[PDB]
Design a protein around this ligand. Structure first.
Ligand SMILES: COc1ccccc1N1CCN(C(=O)c2cc3c(C)nn(-c4ccccc4)c3s2)CC1
Ligand SMILES: [Mg+2]
Ligand SMILES: [Zn+2]
Length: 314
């Protein structure tokens, strides 16, 4: 370091502060974008540049060449967390700022493009090792593995205490990306916010709020400009339909979402997801953290674009 400030071209320098930023098609700039975000979000001092770079490149190596759950998704989810943190400066601890961008970059490590359900019906060894949140316990495991490589300990300055705290933020943040867990997490938050029992000084409450941030960042393709949203959906479904094919190979009719013979039902499927998942997620998030409102507004814009697709207005 340490008078070595990363800088981006002007258009990226400005637009990276906005929730709807797309990191672009130049894979070799993504490490640079992430370090930029860590530097501005956390400090130039929070991590040793040499170690941070080495960690980022091993994380990248451990993402697979799958249509959707890839390195670009990792960096996209970390950019949404960066926009949330930078719009809510004073609400987060020094440990939280450190751990959350790392959690986001690692949250789908070694994803194979298959759901927890498929692993369970295939009888994959991971499903025997981890009975719930199967892929998410795997992703956390891969994170600890990489932190334990020589020259990869980006947390080397933390005390024993702070190190266990930061790895516990990361574990909880990554487990929360299991959408099966989102529904009750958001119900509890909605009740806590409305009865006014929500207390950010309660560690158990902070946990829930970071859980919700993790779902928000993870689903953030629905908060992009329509052409980004529309073209990402193609990647999402290319994984869904492969999984559907693999279900049929086990002798199991897949759900329609995964059946490539039911492509026609995609736009109605997106409506259900926006209504049952996305809109509620950003709504409750915007109640807890008012400056995240642009994510809700962009989500509602994309809902209305999918209504236009159904009405043949596109
Ligand atoms: C009744 O639903 C449930 C009830 C209890 C537990 C689990 C569920 N499932 C909910 C659905 N599940 C999904 O993975 C997802 C389905 C879709 C669809 C359609 N578009 N996107 C998506 C993602 C990211 C961006 C844009 C669009 C997603 S992600 C799995 C779990
Ligand atoms: Mg995941
Ligand atoms: Zn993800």
């Amino acid at each position: 370091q340490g008078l070595m400030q990363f800088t981006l071209p002007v258009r990226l320098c400005k637009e990276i502060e906005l929730f709807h930023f797309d990191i672009g098609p130049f894979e070799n700039m993504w490490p640079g974008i992430f370090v930029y975000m860590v530097h501005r979000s956390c400090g130039t001092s929070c991590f040793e540049l040499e170690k941070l770079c080495r960690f980022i490149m091993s994380v990248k190596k451990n993402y697979r060449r799958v249509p959707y759950h890839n390195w670009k998704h990792a960096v996209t989810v970390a950019h949404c967390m960066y926009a949330i943190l930078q719009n809510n400066h004073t609400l987060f601890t020094d440990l939280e700022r450190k751990g959350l961008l790392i959690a986001c970059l690692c949250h789908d490590l070694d994803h194979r493009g298959f759901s927890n359900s498929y692993l369970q019906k295939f009888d994959h060894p991971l499903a025997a090792l981890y009975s719930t949140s199967t892929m998410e316990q795997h992703h956390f495991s891969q994170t600890v593995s990489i932190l334990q490589l020589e020259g990869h300990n980006i947390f080397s300055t933390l005390s024993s205490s702070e190190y266990e705290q930061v790895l516990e933020i990361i574990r909880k943040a990554i487990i929360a990306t299991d959408l099966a867990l989102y529904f009750g997490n958001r119900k509890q938050l909605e009740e806590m916010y409305q009865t006014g029992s929500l207390n950010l000084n309660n560690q158990s409450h902070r946990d829930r709020v970071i859980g919700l941030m993790m779902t928000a960042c993870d689903l953030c393709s629905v908060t992009k400009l329509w052409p980004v949203t529309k073209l990402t959906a193609n990647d999402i479904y290319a994984e869904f339909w492969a999984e559907g094919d693999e279900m049929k190979k086990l002798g199991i009719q897949p759900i329609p979402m995964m059946d490539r013979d039911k492509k026609d039902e995609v736009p109605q499927g997106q409506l259900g997801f926006y209504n049952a998942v996305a809109i509620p997620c950003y709504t409750t998030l915007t109640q807890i953290l008012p400056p995240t409102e642009p994510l809700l507004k962009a989500c509602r814009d994309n809902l209305s674009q999918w209504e236009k697709v159904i009405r043949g207005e596109e």
